[PDB]
PDB file of C-alpha atoms and ligand atoms in Angstrom:
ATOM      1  CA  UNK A   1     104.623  97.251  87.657  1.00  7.04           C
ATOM      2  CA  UNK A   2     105.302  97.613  91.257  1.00  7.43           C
ATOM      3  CA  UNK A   3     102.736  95.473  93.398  1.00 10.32           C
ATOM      4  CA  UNK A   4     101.841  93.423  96.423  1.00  6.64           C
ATOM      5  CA  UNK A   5      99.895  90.431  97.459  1.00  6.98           C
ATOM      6  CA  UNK A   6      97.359  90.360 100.485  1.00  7.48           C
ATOM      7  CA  UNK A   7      94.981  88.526 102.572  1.00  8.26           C
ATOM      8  CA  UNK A   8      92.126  90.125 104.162  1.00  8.24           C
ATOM      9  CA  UNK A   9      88.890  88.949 105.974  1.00  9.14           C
ATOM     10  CA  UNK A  10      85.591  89.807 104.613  1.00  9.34           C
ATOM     11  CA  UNK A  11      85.472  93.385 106.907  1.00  8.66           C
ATOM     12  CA  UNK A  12      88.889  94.075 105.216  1.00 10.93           C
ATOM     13  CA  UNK A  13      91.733  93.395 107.741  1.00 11.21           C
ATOM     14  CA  UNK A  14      95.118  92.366 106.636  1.00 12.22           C
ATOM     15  CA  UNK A  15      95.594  88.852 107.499  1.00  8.74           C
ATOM     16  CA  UNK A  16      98.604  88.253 105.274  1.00 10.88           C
ATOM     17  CA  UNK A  17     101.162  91.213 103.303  1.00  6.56           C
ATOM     18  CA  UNK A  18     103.639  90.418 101.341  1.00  4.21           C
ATOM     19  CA  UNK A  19     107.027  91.852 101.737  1.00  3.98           C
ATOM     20  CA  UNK A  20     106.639  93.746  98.417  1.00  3.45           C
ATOM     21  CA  UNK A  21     104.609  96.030 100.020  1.00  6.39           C
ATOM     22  CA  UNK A  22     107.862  98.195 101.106  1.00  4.29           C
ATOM     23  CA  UNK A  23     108.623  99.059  97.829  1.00  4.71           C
ATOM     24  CA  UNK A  24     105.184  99.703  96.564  1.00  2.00           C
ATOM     25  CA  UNK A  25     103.765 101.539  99.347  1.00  2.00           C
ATOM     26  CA  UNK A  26     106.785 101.925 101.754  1.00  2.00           C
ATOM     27  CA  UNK A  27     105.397 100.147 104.772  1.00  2.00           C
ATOM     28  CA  UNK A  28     106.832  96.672 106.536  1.00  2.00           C
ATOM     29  CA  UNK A  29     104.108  94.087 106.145  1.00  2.00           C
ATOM     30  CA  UNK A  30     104.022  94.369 110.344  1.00  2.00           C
ATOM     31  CA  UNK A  31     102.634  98.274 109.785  1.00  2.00           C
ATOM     32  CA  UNK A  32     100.255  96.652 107.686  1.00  2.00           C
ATOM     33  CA  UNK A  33      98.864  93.466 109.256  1.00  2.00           C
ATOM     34  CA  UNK A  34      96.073  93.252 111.811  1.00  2.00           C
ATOM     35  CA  UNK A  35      94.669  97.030 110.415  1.00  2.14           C
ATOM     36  CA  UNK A  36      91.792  97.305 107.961  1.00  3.48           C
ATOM     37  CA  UNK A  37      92.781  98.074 104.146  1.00  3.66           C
ATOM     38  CA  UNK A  38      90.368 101.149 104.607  1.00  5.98           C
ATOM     39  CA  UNK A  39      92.504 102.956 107.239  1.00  2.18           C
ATOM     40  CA  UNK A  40      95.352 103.870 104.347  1.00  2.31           C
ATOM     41  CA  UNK A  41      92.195 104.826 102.054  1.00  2.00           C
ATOM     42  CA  UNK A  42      91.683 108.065 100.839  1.00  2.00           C
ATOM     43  CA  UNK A  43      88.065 109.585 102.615  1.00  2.00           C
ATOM     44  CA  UNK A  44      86.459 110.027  98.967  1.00  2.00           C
ATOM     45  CA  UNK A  45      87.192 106.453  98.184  1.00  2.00           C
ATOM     46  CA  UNK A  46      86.525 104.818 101.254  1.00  2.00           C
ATOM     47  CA  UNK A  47      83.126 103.593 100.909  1.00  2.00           C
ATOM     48  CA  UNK A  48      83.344 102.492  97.533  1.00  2.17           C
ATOM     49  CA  UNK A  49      86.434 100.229  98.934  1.00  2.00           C
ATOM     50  CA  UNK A  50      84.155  98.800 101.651  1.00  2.00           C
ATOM     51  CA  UNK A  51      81.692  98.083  99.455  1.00  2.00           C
ATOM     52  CA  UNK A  52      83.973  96.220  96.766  1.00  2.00           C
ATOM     53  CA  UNK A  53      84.715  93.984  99.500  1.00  2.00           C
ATOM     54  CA  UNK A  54      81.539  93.405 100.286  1.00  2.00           C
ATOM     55  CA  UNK A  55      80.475  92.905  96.869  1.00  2.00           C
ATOM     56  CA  UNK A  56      83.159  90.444  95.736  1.00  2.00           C
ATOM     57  CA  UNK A  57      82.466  87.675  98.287  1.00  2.00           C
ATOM     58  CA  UNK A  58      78.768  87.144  96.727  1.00  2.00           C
ATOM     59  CA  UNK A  59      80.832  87.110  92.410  1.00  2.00           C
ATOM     60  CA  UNK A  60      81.549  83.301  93.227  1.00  2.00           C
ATOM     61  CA  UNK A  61      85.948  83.808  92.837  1.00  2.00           C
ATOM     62  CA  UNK A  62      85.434  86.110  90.151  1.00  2.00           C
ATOM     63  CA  UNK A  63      88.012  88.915  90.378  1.00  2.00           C
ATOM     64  CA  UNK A  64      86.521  92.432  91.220  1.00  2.00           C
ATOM     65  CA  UNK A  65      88.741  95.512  90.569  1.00  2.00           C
ATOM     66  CA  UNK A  66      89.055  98.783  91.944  1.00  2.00           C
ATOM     67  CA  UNK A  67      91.073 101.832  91.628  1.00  2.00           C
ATOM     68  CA  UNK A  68      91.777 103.723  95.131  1.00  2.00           C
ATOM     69  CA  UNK A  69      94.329 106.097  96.592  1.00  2.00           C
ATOM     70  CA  UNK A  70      96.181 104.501  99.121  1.00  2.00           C
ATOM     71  CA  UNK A  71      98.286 106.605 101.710  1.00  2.00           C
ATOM     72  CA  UNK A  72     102.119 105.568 101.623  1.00  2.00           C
ATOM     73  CA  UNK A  73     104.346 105.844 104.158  1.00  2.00           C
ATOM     74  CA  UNK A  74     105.371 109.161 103.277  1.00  2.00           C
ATOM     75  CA  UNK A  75     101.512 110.201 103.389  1.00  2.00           C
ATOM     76  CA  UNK A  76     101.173 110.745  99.732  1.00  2.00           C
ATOM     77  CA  UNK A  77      98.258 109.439  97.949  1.00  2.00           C
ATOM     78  CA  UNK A  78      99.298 106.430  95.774  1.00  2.00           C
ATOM     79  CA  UNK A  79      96.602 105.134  92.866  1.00  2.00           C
ATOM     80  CA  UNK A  80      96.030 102.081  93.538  1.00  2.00           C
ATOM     81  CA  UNK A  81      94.508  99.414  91.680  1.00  2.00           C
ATOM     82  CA  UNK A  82      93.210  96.051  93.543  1.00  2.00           C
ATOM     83  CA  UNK A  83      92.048  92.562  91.867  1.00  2.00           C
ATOM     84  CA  UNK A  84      90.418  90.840  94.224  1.00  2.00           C
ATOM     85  CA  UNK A  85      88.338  87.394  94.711  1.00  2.00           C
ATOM     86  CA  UNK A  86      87.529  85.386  97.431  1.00  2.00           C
ATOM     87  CA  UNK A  87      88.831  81.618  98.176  1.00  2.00           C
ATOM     88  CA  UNK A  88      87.636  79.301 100.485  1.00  2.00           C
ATOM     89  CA  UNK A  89      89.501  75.482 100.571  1.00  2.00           C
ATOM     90  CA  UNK A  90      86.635  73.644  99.205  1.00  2.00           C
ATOM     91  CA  UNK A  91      87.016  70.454 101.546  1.00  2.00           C
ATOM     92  CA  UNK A  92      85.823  72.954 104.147  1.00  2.00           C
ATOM     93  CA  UNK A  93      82.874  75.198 105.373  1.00  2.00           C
ATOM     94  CA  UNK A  94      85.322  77.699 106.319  1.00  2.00           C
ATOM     95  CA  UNK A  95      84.774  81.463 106.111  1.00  2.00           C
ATOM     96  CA  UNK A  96      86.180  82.647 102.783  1.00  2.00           C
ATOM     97  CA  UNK A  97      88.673  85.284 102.920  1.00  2.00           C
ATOM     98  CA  UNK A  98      89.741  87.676 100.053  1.00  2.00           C
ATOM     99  CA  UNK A  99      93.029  87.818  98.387  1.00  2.00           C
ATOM    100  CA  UNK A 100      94.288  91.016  96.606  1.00  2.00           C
ATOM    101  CA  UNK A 101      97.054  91.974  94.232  1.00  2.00           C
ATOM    102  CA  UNK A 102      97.678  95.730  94.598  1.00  2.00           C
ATOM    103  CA  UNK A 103      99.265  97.800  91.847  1.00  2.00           C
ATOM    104  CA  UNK A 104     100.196 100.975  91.831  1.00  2.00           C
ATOM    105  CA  UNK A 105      99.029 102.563  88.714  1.00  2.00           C
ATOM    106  CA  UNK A 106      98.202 105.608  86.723  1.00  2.00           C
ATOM    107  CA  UNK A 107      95.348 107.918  87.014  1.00  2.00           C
ATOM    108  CA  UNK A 108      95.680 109.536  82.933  1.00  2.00           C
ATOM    109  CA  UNK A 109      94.356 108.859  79.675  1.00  2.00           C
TER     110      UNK A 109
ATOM    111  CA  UNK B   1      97.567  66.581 111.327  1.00  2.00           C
ATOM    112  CA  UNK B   2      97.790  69.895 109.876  1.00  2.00           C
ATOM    113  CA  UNK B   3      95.310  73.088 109.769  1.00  2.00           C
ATOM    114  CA  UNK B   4      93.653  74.152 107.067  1.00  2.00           C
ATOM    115  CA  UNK B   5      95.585  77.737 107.041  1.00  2.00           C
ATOM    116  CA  UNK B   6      98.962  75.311 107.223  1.00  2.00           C
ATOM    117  CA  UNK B   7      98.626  72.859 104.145  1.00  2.00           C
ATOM    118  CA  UNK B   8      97.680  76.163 101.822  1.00  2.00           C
ATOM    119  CA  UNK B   9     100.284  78.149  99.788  1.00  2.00           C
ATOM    120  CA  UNK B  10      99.834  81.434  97.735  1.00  2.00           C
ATOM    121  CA  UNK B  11     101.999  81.737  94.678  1.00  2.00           C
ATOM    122  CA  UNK B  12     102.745  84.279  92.022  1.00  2.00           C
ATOM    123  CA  UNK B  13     103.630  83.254  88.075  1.00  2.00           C
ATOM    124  CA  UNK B  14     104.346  85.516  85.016  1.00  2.00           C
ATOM    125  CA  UNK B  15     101.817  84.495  82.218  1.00  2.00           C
ATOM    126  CA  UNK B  16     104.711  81.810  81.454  1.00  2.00           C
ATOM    127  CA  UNK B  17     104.091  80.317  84.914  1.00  2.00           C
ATOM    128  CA  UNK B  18     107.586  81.052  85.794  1.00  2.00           C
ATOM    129  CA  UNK B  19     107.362  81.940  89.699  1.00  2.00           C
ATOM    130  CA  UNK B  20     107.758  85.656  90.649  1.00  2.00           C
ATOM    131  CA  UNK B  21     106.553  85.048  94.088  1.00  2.00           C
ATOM    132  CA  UNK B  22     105.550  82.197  96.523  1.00  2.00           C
ATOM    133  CA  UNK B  23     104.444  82.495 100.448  1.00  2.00           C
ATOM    134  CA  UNK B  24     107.161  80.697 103.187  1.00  2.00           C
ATOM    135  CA  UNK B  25     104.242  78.050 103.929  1.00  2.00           C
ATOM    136  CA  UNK B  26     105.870  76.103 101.117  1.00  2.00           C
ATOM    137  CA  UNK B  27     108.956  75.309 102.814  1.00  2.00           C
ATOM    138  CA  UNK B  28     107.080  73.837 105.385  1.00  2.00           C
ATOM    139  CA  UNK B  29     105.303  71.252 103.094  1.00  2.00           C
ATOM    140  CA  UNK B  30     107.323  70.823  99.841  1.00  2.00           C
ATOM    141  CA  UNK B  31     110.805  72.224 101.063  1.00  2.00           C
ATOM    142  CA  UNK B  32     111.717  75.033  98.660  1.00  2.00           C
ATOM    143  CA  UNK B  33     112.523  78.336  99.978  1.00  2.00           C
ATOM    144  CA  UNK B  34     110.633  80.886  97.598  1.00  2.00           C
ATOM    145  CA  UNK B  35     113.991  82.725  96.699  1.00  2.00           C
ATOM    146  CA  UNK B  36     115.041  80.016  95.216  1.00  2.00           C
ATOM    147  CA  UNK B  37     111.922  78.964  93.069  1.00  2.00           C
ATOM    148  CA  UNK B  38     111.708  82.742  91.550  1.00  2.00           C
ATOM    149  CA  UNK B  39     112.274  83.190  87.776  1.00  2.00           C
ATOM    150  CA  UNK B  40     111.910  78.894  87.525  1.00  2.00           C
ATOM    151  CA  UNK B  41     108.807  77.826  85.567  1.00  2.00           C
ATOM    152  CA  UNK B  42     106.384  76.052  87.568  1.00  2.00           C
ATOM    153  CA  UNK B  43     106.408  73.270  84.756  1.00  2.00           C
ATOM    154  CA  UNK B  44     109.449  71.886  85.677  1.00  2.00           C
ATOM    155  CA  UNK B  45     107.851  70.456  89.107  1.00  2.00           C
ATOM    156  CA  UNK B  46     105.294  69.108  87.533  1.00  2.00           C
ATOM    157  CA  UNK B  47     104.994  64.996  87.240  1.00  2.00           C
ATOM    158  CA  UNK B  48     105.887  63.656  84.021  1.00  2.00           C
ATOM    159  CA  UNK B  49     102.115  61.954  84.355  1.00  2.00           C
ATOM    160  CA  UNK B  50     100.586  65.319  85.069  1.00  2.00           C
ATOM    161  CA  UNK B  51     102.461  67.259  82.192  1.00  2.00           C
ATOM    162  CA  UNK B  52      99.660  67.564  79.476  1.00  2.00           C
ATOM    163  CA  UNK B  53      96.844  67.876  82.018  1.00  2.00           C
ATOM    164  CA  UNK B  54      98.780  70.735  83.588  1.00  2.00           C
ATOM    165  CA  UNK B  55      99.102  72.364  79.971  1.00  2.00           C
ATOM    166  CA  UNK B  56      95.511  71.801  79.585  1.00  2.00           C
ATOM    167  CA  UNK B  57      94.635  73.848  82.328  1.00  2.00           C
ATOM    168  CA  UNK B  58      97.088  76.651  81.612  1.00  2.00           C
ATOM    169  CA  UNK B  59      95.561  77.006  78.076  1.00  2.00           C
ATOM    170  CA  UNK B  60      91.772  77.011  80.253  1.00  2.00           C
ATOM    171  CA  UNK B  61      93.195  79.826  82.601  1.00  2.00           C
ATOM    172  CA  UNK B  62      94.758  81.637  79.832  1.00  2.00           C
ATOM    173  CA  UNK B  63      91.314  81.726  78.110  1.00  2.00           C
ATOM    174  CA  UNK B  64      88.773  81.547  80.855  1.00  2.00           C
ATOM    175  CA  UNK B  65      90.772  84.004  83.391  1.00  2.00           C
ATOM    176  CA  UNK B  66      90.177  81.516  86.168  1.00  2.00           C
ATOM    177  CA  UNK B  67      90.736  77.728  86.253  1.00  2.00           C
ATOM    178  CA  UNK B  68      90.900  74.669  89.083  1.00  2.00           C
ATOM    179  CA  UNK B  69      93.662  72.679  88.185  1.00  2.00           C
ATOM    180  CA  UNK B  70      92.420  69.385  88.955  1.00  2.00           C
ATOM    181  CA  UNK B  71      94.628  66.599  91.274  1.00  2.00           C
ATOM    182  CA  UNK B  72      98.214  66.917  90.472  1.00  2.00           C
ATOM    183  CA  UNK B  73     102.145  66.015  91.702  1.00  2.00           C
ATOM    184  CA  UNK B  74     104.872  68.367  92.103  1.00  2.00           C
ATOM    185  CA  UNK B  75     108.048  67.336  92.806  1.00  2.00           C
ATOM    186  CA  UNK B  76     109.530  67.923  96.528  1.00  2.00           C
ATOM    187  CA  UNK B  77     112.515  69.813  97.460  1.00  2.00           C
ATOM    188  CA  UNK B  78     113.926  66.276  98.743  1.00  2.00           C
ATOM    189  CA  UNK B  79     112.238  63.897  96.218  1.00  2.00           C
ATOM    190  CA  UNK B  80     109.401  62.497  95.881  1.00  2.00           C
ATOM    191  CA  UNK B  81     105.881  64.489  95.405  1.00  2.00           C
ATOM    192  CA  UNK B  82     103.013  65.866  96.919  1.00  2.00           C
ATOM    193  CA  UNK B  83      99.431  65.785  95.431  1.00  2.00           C
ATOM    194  CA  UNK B  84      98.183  69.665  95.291  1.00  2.00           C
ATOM    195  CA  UNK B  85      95.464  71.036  93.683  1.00  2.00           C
ATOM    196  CA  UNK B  86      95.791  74.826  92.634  1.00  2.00           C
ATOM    197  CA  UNK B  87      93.125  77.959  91.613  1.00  2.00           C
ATOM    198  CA  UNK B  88      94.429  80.078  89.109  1.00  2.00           C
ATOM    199  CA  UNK B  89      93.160  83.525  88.355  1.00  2.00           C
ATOM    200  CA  UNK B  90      94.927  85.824  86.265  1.00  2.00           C
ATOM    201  CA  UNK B  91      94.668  89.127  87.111  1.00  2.00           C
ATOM    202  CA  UNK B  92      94.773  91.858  84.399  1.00  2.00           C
ATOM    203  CA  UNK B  93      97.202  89.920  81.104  1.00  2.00           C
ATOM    204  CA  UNK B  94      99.509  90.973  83.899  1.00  2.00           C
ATOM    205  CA  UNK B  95     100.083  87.989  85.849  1.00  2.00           C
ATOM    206  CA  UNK B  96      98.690  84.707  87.264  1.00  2.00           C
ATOM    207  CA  UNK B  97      97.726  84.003  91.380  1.00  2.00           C
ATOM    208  CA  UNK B  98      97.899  80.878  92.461  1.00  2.00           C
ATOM    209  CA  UNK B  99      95.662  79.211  95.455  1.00  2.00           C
ATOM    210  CA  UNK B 100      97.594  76.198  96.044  1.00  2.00           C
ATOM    211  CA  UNK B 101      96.468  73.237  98.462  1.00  2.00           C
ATOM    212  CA  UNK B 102      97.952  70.096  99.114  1.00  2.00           C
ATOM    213  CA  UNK B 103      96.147  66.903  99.131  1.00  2.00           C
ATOM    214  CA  UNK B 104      98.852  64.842 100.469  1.00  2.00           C
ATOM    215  CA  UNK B 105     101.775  63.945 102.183  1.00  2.00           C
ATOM    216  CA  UNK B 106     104.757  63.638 100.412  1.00  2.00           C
ATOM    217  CA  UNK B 107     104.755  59.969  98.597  1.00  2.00           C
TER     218      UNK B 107
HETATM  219  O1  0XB C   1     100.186  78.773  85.884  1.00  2.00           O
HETATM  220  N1  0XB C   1     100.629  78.235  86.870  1.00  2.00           N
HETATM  221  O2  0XB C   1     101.627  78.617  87.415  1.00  2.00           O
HETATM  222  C1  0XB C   1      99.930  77.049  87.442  1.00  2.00           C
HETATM  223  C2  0XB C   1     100.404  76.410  88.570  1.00  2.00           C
HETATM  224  N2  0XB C   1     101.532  76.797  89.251  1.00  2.00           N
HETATM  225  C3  0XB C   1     102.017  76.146  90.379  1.00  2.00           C
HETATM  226  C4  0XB C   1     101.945  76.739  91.621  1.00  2.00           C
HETATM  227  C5  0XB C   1     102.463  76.085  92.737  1.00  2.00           C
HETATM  228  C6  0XB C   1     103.047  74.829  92.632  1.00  2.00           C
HETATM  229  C7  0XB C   1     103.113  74.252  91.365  1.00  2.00           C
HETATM  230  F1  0XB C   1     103.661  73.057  91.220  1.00  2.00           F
HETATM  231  C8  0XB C   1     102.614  74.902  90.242  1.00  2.00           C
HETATM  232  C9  0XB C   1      99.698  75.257  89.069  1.00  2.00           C
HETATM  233  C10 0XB C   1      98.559  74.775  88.504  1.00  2.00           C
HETATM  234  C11 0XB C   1      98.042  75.419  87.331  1.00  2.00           C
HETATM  235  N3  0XB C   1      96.970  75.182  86.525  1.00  2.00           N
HETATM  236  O3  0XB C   1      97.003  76.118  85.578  1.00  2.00           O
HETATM  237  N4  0XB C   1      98.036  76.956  85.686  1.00  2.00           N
HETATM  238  C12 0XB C   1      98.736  76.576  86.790  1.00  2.00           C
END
């Protein structure tokens, strides 16, 4: 399974990519950081990606998944599939932030 | 004194904890460079004293799908170890994702 780590802030900016990412979606992880996840989201699926995000900060770390197409560097739509949860270093009040593992997988059955 | 940001690492295990990725923040506090901690099991940096306790909570992750590890050592690239504490959430089993903190310098 080809896949990717990443950080994001609760509006969905990349705050951390991991160098993976060029062989699962063929950007470097400098294409990547400091733009919002939803910018290489397919239109149909965009919404239901912000709203994921905005959903899985209130699950307490649980992991939410979704399933989105995610335009590669050769502008072909990849299926993606995200687990996310949110962390926050518990010795602190600090915002929490999300982290991702991104997968590209199949869209069959 | 270090950031928050600067004493956190993320890490990457197969279900067998051996490493198949870890951030470059780790060199900075424990010494390792990640290419050289990939396909090692994360047991074998482990303190002796934290062995079964560490087992413990891999059986709770592997069961649960999340876990906090609890206070533990692992060994430093140079000797001696640093207290960490690590969230585990495996993601689906497919692999595990590691959160890991340190609580220390290196003693
Ligand atoms: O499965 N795991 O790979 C796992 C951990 N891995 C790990 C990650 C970083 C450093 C280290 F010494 C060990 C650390 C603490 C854990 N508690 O349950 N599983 C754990």
């Amino acid at each position: 399974p080809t896949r990717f780590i990443s950080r994001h802030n609760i509006e969905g900016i990349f705050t951390f990519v991991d160098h993976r990412c060029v062989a699962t979606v063929g950007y470097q992880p400098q294409e990547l950081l400091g733009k919002n996840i939803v910018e290489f989201c397919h239109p149909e699926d965009q919404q239901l990606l912000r709203d994921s995000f905005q959903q899985v900060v209130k699950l307490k770390g649980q992991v939410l998944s979704v399933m989105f197409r995610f335009r590669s560097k050769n502008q072909e739509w990849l299926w993606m599939r995200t687990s996310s949860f949110t962390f926050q270093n518990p010795y602190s009040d600090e915002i929490e932030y999300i982290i991702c593992t991104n997968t590209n997988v199949k869209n069959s059955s | 004194f270090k950031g928050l940001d600067s004493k956190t690492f993320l890490s990457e295990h197969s279900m067998d904890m051996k490493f198949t990725y870890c951030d470059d923040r780790i060199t900075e506090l424990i010494g390792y460079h990640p290419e050289e901690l990939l396909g090692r099991s994360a047991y074998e940096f482990y303190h002796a004293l934290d062995s079964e306790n560490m087992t413990k909570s891999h059986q709770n992750l592997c069961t649960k799908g999340q876990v906090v590890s609890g206070q533990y050592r692992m060994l430093a690239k140079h000797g001696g170890y640093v207290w960490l504490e690590t969230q585990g959430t495996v993601i689906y089993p497919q692999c595990i994702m590691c959160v890991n903190y340190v609580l220390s310098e290196i003693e």
